[PDB]
Design a protein around this nucleic acid. Structure first.
Lengths: 99, 335, 83, 80, 95, 108, 99, 88, 108, 93
DNA sequence: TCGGATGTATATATCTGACACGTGCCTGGAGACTAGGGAGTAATCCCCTTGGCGGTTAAAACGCGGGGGACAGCGCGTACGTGCGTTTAAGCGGTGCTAGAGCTGTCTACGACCAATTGAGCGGCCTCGGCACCGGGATTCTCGAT
DNA sequence: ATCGAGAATCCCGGTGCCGAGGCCGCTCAATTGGTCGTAGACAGCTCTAGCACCGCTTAAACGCACGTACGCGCTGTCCCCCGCGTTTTAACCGCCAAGGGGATTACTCCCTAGTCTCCAGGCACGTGTCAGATATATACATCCGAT
């Protein structure tokens, strides 16, 4: 019978190691493709500086991390530990993004 | 008590400003407290001295009106009398024991507020019972509760402003937030054998026999004369992370003690630090702590031992010194 | 030629990493899709501004300063890419 | 204090000059002390305290300068 | 055909750093962030000062409009210390 | 002092008083610019820069580093109560977040 | 035995009548005194235009009504009907006012 | 200053519990806990302290002794609280 | 058109092209102002004014009042999904709120 | 004395165009003036920033058009661009 | 379902003060003309963006077992809503006083502008040590079994 | 309570590489000096509107009593997230190759600022009347205890 960790300790392990670090957590090629897809929906035959895509990724990941902090607060308010889509919706509603 | 106007002035206040001699006499004989303070700190004596009503001053001082009590900016009645140039009021106040060497927050004696030679020479040297406990166990807590429900008194579990009586289990005063808040706000610190005493006698007997000497005694005396708080005029910057007494504990205790919490580190060679011209009232008369009132409080566990204890106007004090000052109600020198 | 369904390249592991940096211990299974939707909106709001700057400069390359201006224009000031 | 105090004066070079000045000393006396310590003529000196310039007539104590408090010295004639 | 030289506060930030911390250095990305910071605060203070001059029908930005903009923008102790430093620099300059 | 050395050294500053003066003159802020506006603004900017750099150097020493990286600027800004309020709506590239976990997620 | 309404119907009655109307809900003299007290803490011997105090009251009441809307949303999230101080704190935290 | 200084104090209690209840009813709140009122007062104070301090900061710059409605409007606009109907 | 009637009517507008031109010139926005910038800006301002005024007049008629008050402007702005996006951080004096009661609080 | 300018008569002319029979109160007209000034400041500030970014010293009508595209939400921006373009072509021609 | 008790909506007089319109005028906008520099256009250079392979391997995807957390039901007790009688102080109106906002007129000092000059600061070279990476030994959380 | 095995992370030392920190040439932007016109500082005067007080009316706040509905704790179930192992996909890195389009420069013209003259558009003020507020009376819809 192999060794096994209880559900929740590796999650805390990951919380600590991803709050210590500062790299980007999304893969770069898929995000670049997503950026180009949205851009082609706006204007055709666009080119991007690599710095432009890197700035977009910085902004997007900062936004998502902040939104997940607010989502966690909303989940803890409802006396829960799991974050649910309604927590995201309440956070966005209060920040003035959803209405 | 008695209702006041929006500026905090009691009827005795307004009578003192207006100089109504029959009104002040009638109010005084009716039980009106002469030692009341408005929202800025002025007593009726301050108003009488500032305007020049000699007879009002005499009636007030007759009715146990404290003469050394400090008003707004720690002005004293002698400060008001000398600043407006009323020689007879100065004579009366000195005859009634008002100190000529007291200072306000700016460290200016009444002499410094005048220039008249004669009065300069005269100035020159020629309530419901609120109960609360500190770390009491089950039987003690229940027995204070039963005393509360037989005396019809309000007992609290968390400390707040309107507390009057604080009960300590041991003989000495406990070094906990409960007793520290009690001593800073001047509450009655009573040993446990007091409360059971009432249960043994069924009477609200005397409490000066149950007051710890040289500890809460000085604080209670200081408050009963309406003098400033212990840390009046002192600024504190809390540097580092703390383990014994948390940051919130120290901040709350500082604020409740009359001090002010600084948010930036007090660089000694900075104009903001140098230009703080306040004076610590409860310091030694001639120590460095009168004008050097800014402290950097650090915990001994962090152990940032400075090369010099004081540099400029800024001391570097361990949190142990701060706690010891709070327990003893005194600004203990760091040198 | 066009690109499609690249939002699915923001995988579930990446969303859980972003949640872990946010301090999240447990994640419901319906979060990921929700998150992707949110991300799309944010991205569409920024790129639309960035491209609008790019068209005004009469450029055909979107520069990093277009993105910086687009983010600052909606209260998301970003330090480190110029400006 | 009130008998003898030790103050500092900061120069644009970054060096700190230590002066033993009486609390009742005038700014002219402080300029004379700086002249003795460094050789700078008083006419070239301007003293700054608390974002104000110090006048020659008024004394140190009336500017509320305590012990171990820092002044600033700027050259008015032939600086650099 | 010469390249266009671009300006930055890199040397000034480095001088300030070698004042406060004579031994530590700084990387290129940290200097980029510091230049962004200086530019951001410059436009904040200058825009507030411009609005202040427009409200009072003044056609000049003086040092007291910069002072009021500093008081409006920075939080408490920061504003107090920044006002102190600005005043000392202005008097040091005019004296 | 009214010297001729340079306006920065005349003011006692490291930041450029002349460059700040030009940026105020050409930035479309007002019709005129006083002679003491660039000095005051350069002094304020230098003070804020020194604040952030001192805190960041402290954070770099705590990590046993002798070179400031954006992580240390992030830590310095977010750990200061007033700098975190001045830069509340600012994201710092390659900066990360402050490590803190809500107390209800920790094991009992 | 007099007539009595169940707890909750008069509350809805008040909700409707205060959302139909547009007047100020705080008394004017107490609010003016509060404004002057805060101002005296900032600068001494200040005078106020009556329009200044009216603008301050407009802004304050609009702020409080919006904050109570967000507080009600936070209370409903926690599966409650009663608004509690923690709902106010969560709302202010998410709006970026509390941190 | 030779004359005394008189100050106001404890006027936040003039924001009574019925007034907070009316403000909650306009906000759609059906039921209110007893600890809201004190909480609300604290919140209000902070808001006011942030606006007044800016308004006075404008008033001092114009070298005025009267806080006009335009000072309040500017102070509100400065923190994303644009108010229509009092000027500007 | 190459007319000389007046710039507002020349553009076909009711808002003042000349006043907008002066406000642009003397507002510290740029060194120079193009000839067509005041015309474009006045046209946009007039369009937005007409949008809000039409919605507010509809609100006034629905309340069977023949005069617009701040309540009608508030209702118009908050009920349109884009005027509420443009004016979402704006409080309107004597405006009130949109009447909504969350479905949870209604009687069973 | 001093005379102060306002957009009251233009707002009233527009109102008489769109709703020929309704009137407007003094407070609603004050709110309308505040709205016009607010939007003017927004669009002119964005146009100024656009001209500064591209190192232009002139605010032309395409800076105003780009500012309108950046500030107004979708259909509002579409119709406002249409109105501005129509006005400029009618004025020039 | 059923009928009182109640709160809100609908209809009529009528009073007022605020909205809409008219008038004098004066200042700001418009028309004409001149000069100069901003911006449009053309041409060129070269950077840096896009596209393509090939390999390696880090990470994503999938599956499964199980435990812990979400959620529903239930009971209690306490604190909040509702209503009534009492008390407070807000609101209104009116009078009286004066500080200070607001405007006008001199007139001086400061900021713009222009020409000349020269040192500060930027771009390019380059070189070493700070930090990254790796590899082994040591310590410390973790968890299942007593 | 407690020890003990398995993982995870940290500590210490060795190697290397590339970017930070400093040097050098040069050029252009900041500094200096003089002139000029006007912005704004200062003094004075007007008159508005902010402040203070007083008395009366009554609306709203306050205190209290009662009851019930809702918050909160507890228990039980079950399902769905987590942890871990294995397989598969495609990210990432290194490389090379083209060429589009971003910068840069030179020239030129035409669009806008600046000045002056002139006059009507819009602002302040004065005045009539009617839309909306308020009082008064019923009528109907809603709530709730009791059928």
């Amino acid at each position: 019978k192999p060794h096994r960790y209880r559900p929740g300790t590796v999650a805390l392990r990951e919380i600590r190691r991803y709050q210590k670090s500062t790299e980007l957590l999304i893969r770069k090629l898929p995000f670049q493709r997503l950026v180009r897809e949205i851009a082609q929906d706006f204007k055709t035959d666009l080119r991007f500086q690599s710095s432009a895509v890197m700035a977009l990724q910085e902004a997007c990941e900062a936004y998502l991390v902040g939104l997940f902090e607010d989502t966690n607060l909303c989940a803890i308010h409802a006396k829960r530990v799991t974050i649910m889509p309604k927590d995201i919706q309440l956070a966005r509603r209060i920040r003035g993004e959803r209405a | 008590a008695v209702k006041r106007n929006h500026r905090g002035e009691t009827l005795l206040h307004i009578a003192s400003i207006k100089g109504d001699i029959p009104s002040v006499e009638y109010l005084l004989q009716n039980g009106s407290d002469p030692n009341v303070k408005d929202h800025a700190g002025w007593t009726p004596l301050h108003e009488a001295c500032n305007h020049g009503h000699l007879k009002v001053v005499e009636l007030l001082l007759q009715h146990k009106a404290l003469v050394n009590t400090t008003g707004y900016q720690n002005d004293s009645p002698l400060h008001d009398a000398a600043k407006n140039g009323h020689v007879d009021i100065v004579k009366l106040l000195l005859s009634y024991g008002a100190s000529r060497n007291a200072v306000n927050i700016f460290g200016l004696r009444p002499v410094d507020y005048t220039d008249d030679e004669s009065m300069k020479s005269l100035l020159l040297l020629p309530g419901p019972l609120v109960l609360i406990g500190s770390g009491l166990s089950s039987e003690q807590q229940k027995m204070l509760s039963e005393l509360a429900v037989i005396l019809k008194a309000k007992k609290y579990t968390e400390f707040d402003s309107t507390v009057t009586h604080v009960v300590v289990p041991g003989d000495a005063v406990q070094s906990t937030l409960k007793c520290m808040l009690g001593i800073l706000n001047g509450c009655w610190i009573l040993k446990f054998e007091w409360v059971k005493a009432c249960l043994r006698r069924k009477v609200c007997e005397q409490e000066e026999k149950y007051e710890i000497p040289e500890g809460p005694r000085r604080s209670r005396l200081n408050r009963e004369q309406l003098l400033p708080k212990l840390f009046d005029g002192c600024y504190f910057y809390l540097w580092g992370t703390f383990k014994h007494h948390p940051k919130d504990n120290l901040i709350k205790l500082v604020t409740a003690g009359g001090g002010q919490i600084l948010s930036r580190k007090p660089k000694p060679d900075s104009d903001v630090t140098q230009t703080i011209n306040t004076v610590a009232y409860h310091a030694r008369p001639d120590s460095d702590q009168r004008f050097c009132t800014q402290y950097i409080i650090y915990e001994d566990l962090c152990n940032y031992h400075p090369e010099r204890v004081r540099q400029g106007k800024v001391w570097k004090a361990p949190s142990s010194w701060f706690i010891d000052c709070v327990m003893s109600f005194e600004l203990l020198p760091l040198d | 030629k066009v690109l499609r369904d690249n939002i699915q390249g923001i995988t579930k592991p990446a969303i859980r990493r972003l949640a872990r940096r946010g301090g999240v211990k447990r994640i419901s299974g319906l979060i990921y899709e929700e998150t992707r939707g949110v991300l799309k909106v944010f991205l569409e709001n920024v790129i639309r501004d960035a491209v609008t700057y790019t068209e005004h400069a009469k450029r055909k390359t979107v520069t990093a300063m277009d993105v910086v201006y687009a983010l600052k224009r909606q209260g998301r000031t970003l330090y480190g890419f110029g400006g | 204090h009130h008998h003898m105090m030790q103050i500092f004066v900061k120069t644009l070079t970054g060096k700190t000059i230590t002066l033993e000045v009486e609390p009742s000393d005038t700014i002219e006396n402080v300029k004379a002390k700086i002249q003795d310590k460094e050789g700078i003529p008083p006419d070239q000196q301007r003293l700054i305290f608390a974002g104000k310039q110090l006048e020659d007539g008024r004394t140190l104590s009336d500017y509320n300068i305590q012990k171990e408090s820092t002044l600033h010295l700027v050259l008015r004639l032939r600086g650099g | 055909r010469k390249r266009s030289r671009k300006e930055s506060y890199s040397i000034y930030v480095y001088k300030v750093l070698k004042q406060v911390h004579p031994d530590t250095g700084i990387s290129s990305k940290a200097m980029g962030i510091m230049n962004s910071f200086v530019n951001d605060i410059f436009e904040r203070i200058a825009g507030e000062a411009s609005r202040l001059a427009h409200y009072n029908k003044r056609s000049t930005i003086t040092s007291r409009e910069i002072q009021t903009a500093v008081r409006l923008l920075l939080p408490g102790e920061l504003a107090k210390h920044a006002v102190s430093e600005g005043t000392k620099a202005v008097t040091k300059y005019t004296s | 002092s009214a010297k001729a050395k340079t306006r920065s050294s005349r003011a006692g500053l490291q930041f450029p008083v002349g460059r700040v003066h030009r940026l105020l003159r050409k930035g479309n802020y007002s019709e005129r610019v006083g002679a003491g506006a660039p000095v005051y603004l350069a002094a304020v900017l230098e003070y804020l820069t020194a604040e952030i750099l001192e805190l960041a150097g402290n954070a770099a020493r705590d990590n046993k580093k002798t070179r400031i990286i954006p992580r240390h600027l992030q830590l310095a800004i977010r750990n200061d109560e007033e700098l975190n309020k001045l830069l509340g709506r600012v994201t710092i590239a390659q900066g990360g977040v402050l490590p803190n976990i809500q107390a209800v997620l920790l094991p009992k």
